[PDB]
C-alpha cells in the first residue's frame, strides 16, 4: 500500500505543559502510608511536551530517547497504536502495536513500514458498527519471532508510558475520563503497568498510528480524502530523576514532588 500524505506541512512544534503528570508505579511492591524516594526514569513536572493535533496530523517519527510519555484526548478511537523500531525498515526487527475494537495485536517483525503509516476506517451501511479497518502500515512483514494478542489497551483521556529496559518492553497505562478543554489536566493520577513484553530489540524511534477516513476519492491520486477526524495527542520524554511518592494506606500513589524542580521541592 503505502499511500503517503506528508506533502509539505512543516509547522513548528507546539509545546503544552504537563503539570503533574506521567507518574507510574516504578516498582513491584505494595507500600503502606509511607513517603518513598524513588530514583528512576520519570517525566519531570511542569515540562514542555510536544503537542500534535489535527490542524492534517503531521504524524512524524519521533525519538524514543529513553522512554516516552504518551497522552491522547481522542474522544473517538483515532489513536490506534505505535510502530517503535530502530530503522522502521527491513533488516531490523521492529515492534507494532495495534488494537482493532476488541483485541490488541503485538508483533516484532522486520516490517517494511510506510513513510506515513495509518489505518483506514470504513463504515458499511448494512451494520454501521463494523469499522472495517484496512492496514496501510507496512508493505512486507516476514521472518518474525514474538506475537502477542490480548484485550485492547484503549473525552476519555488516555496516558501511556513506554520504556525499554534490559530487553523488556514495559507499558504503563491509565485511562481517565476528562472534562478539561484542550490540554492535559492538573489532578494527580498514577500509571499502572499493563504488560511487560520480553521483546529484546533495540528501539530508538517511534511513530503513532492514526485512523483516517476516505472523505472523497479523486480518480488518480490515492491521497485525496484522508481526513483525520478530530483528536490530539502529546509526547513527553522520560529523564532520570528522583521523585518522592506518597503511598496511600491501600498502596496507591496519591501524590509526589520532583527533586531539582525548585528549591522547596529539594
Amino acid at each position, epitope marked *: 500500500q503505502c499511500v503517503n500524505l506528508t506533502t509539505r506541512t512543516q509547522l513548528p512544534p507546539a509545546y503544552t505543559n504537563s503539570f503533574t503528570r506521567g507518574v507510574y508505579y516504578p516498582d513491584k511492591v505494595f507500600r503502606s502510608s509511607v513517603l518513598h524516594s524513588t530514583q528512576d526514569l520519570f517525566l519531570p513536572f511542569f515540562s514542555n511536551v510536544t503537542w500534535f493535533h489535527a490542524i492534517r496530523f503531521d504524524n512524524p517519527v519521533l525519538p524514543f530517547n529513553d522512554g516516552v510519555y504518551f497522552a491522547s484526548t481522542e474522544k473517538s478511537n483515532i489513536i490506534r497504536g505505535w510502530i517503535f523500531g530502530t530503522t522502521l525498515d527491513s533488516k531490523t526487527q521492529s515492534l507494532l502495536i495495534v488494537n482493532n475494537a476488541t483485541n490488541v495485536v503485538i508483533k516484532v517483525c522486520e516490517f517494511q513500514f510506510c513513510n506515513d503509516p495509518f489505518l483506514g476506517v470504513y463504515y458499511h451501511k448494512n451494520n454501521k458498527s463494523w469499522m472495517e479497518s484496512e492496514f496501510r502500515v507496512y508493505s512486507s512483514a516476514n521472518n518474525c519471532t514474538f506475537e502477542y494478542v490480548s484485550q485492547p489497551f484503549l473525552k476519555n483521556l488516555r496516558e501511556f508510558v513506554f520504556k525499554n529496559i534490559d530487553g523488556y518492553f514495559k507499558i504503563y497505562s491509565k485511562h481517565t475520563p476528562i472534562n478539561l478543554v484542550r490540554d492535559l489536566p492538573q489532578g494527580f493520577s498514577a500509571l499502572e503497568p499493563l504488560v511487560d513484553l520480553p521483546i529484546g530489540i533495540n528501539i530508538t524511534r517511534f511513530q503513532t498510528l492514526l485512523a483516517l477516513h476516505r472523505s*472523497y476519492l479523486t480518480p488518480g491520486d490515492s491521497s485525496s480524502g484522508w481526513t483525520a477526524g478530530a483528536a490530539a495527542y502529546y509526547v513527553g520524554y522520560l529523564q532520570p530523576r528522583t521523585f518522592l511518592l506518597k503511598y496511600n494506606e491501600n498502596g496507591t500513589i496519591t501524590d509526589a514532588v520532583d527533586c531539582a524542580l525548585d528549591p522547596l521541592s529539594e
Partner: antibody
Framework: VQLVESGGGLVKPGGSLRLSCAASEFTFSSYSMNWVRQAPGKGLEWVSSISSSGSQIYYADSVKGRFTISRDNAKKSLYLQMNSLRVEDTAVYYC??????????????????WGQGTTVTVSS | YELTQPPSVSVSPGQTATITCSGDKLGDKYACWYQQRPGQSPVLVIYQDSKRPSGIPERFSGSNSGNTATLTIGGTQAMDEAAYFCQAWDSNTGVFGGGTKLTVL
C-alpha cells in the same frame, strides 16, 4: 497513475499469452488491481483481481485454473498469465485500479484508472 | 449473483434520465456505476450507492433501496449517450451488470 498495457496478439486456441499493465508512478503500490476484458460485441467482464500486497487473489468462475495474475510494486507492473487461451477469450482487456487495499474494502470503491486496452484474438 | 439492467433507454436532450439495476437483496450491497462512451474506456461516475467522485457534475445522482439500484441524470445532454454498467461486489466477486445504453436525440 498512468497505465499502459501490452502483450495482446494473434494466438491459436489453447495457446499461451502473458499480458501486462505498466504504471507511470510508484503510487501503483497503493492500488488493488483488476483485470476486465471487453468483448468485441458486448461490454465488460471481470477477469481477476489482486490486493495491494498481492496476497488476496481472486478469479472469475470461468477462468480459474487457467490465468495467473501477479504484480510487482517495485517494478510498477501488473501481469496476467494467459494459459489455455480458449475459444471465447478473444476480447480487449482493461487493467483497472480499485484503491481499496484489501478485498474487504473493495466494495467501498470503484475501478477508476483504466489504461488503453490490449486486443487479444484467439482463432484457428 | 447477477445484476439485471434494461438493454437500453432513451430520452430527449435536456430531460431527466432514469436507469435501473436489479439484484437479489441488492439494497444491502454497494453498487458502482460506469460510463462507457463508444470507443472509450469506462469512467467511474457513482460509487457507494450515494456518493459522487471528484470531477463529476452533480446531475449524476444515484440511489439504492430494496432490490433495485437506480441512477438519475437531470438535464441530460448530448454526451450522456453512453453505455452504463451497474457494478456490485458479492463474496469478493466482481460481477458487472448488463449495461444499459442511453440514447439522446
Amino acid at each position: 497513475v498512468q497505465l499502459v498495457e501490452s502483450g495482446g496478439g494473434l494466438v491459436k486456441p489453447g495457446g499461451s499469452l502473458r499480458l501486462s499493465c505498466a504504471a507511470s508512478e510508484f503510487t501503483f503500490s497503493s492500488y488493488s488491481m483488476n483485470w476486465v476484458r471487453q468483448a468485441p460485441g458486448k461490454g465488460l467482464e471481470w477477469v481477476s483481481s489482486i490486493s495491494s500486497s498481492g496476497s488476496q487473489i481472486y478469479y472469475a468462475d470461468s477462468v480459474k485454473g487457467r490465468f495467473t495474475i501477479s504484480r510487482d510494486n517495485a517494478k510498477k507492473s501488473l501481469y496476467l498469465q494467459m494459459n489455455s487461451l480458449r475459444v471465447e477469450d478473444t476480447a480487449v482487456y482493461y487493467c483497472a485500479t480499485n484503491g481499496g487495499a484489501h478485498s474487504s474494502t473493495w466494495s467501498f470503491y470503484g475501478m477508476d484508472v483504466w489504461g488503453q486496452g490490449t486486443t487479444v484474438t484467439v482463432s484457428s | 449473483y447477477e445484476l439485471t439492467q434494461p438493454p437500453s433507454v432513451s430520452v430527449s436532450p435536456g430531460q431527466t434520465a432514469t436507469i435501473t439495476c436489479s439484484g437479489d437483496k441488492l439494497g444491502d450491497k454497494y453498487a458502482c456505476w460506469y460510463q462507457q462512451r463508444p470507443g472509450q474506456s469506462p469512467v467511474l461516475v457513482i460509487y457507494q450507492d450515494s456518493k459522487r467522485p471528484s470531477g463529476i457534475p452533480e446531475r449524476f445522482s444515484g440511489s439504492n433501496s430494496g432490490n433495485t439500484a437506480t441512477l438519475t441524470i437531470g438535464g441530460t445532454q448530448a454526451m450522456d449517450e453512453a453505455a452504463y454498467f451497474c457494478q456490485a461486489w458479492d463474496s469478493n466477486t466482481g460481477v458487472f451488470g448488463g449495461g444499459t445504453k442511453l440514447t439522446v436525440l
